[PDB]
């Protein structure tokens, strides 16, 4: 239902571990969905290539991001540094939850995170925009390179892009 799919190749140390496509619910949350879509294609002058999952915790979530202004942002939006959410439709009631990372409300639009587990303690907070439709096994494989403190023993970069639309 006018849902864009964003496709990536997930690579550990540059070596393709697999590939993950995410269904963006643009019919529900058009702002936060098209935001990440325009980051990944980079038509807004950003071109998010090689996006490194540098912050991953097992039994929780695998979070990716970029080197551009890594301090305090590290993966800014088409709204720039940070923006406020459109509407809190999509709750974190499932696995593979693709949602852009934040410190809180009006601080969304810096990096992204994929909740490998159903993180329900993230309800009443920043809304989801997409979910892993294919490659959830690769997402939980990324999780296995992460550490409890947020450390990543392996350098998991988004090798390539090419959204299925």
């Amino acid at each position: 239902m006018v849902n864009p799919t964003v496709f990536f190749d997930i690579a550990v140390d540059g070596e393709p571990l697999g590939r993950v496509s995410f269904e963006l619910f643009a019919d529900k949350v058009p702002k936060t969905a098209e935001n990440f879509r325009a980051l990944s294609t980079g038509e807004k002058g950003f071109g998010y290539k090689g996006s490194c999952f540098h912050r991953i915790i097992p039994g929780f979530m695998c979070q990716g991001g970029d080197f551009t202004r890594h301090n305090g942002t590290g993966g800014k939006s088409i709204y720039g540094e940070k923006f406020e959410d459109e509407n809190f439709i999509l709750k974190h009631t499932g696995p593979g939850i693709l949602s852009m990372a934040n410190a809180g409300p009006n601080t969304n639009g810096s990096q992204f995170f994929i909740c490998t587990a159903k993180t329900e303690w993230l309800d009443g907070k920043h809304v989801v925009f997409g979910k892993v439709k294919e490659g959830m096994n690769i997402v939980e494989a990324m999780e296995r390179f992460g550490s409890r403190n947020g450390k990543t023993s392996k350098k998991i970069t988004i090798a390539d892009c090419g959204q299925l639309e």
Binding site: R55, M61, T73, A101, S110, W121
Partner: peptide
């Protein structure tokens, strides 16, 4: 201590 969610005390 960064833009990102938390869990696991």
């Amino acid at each position: 201590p960064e833009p990102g969610p938390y869990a696991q005390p």
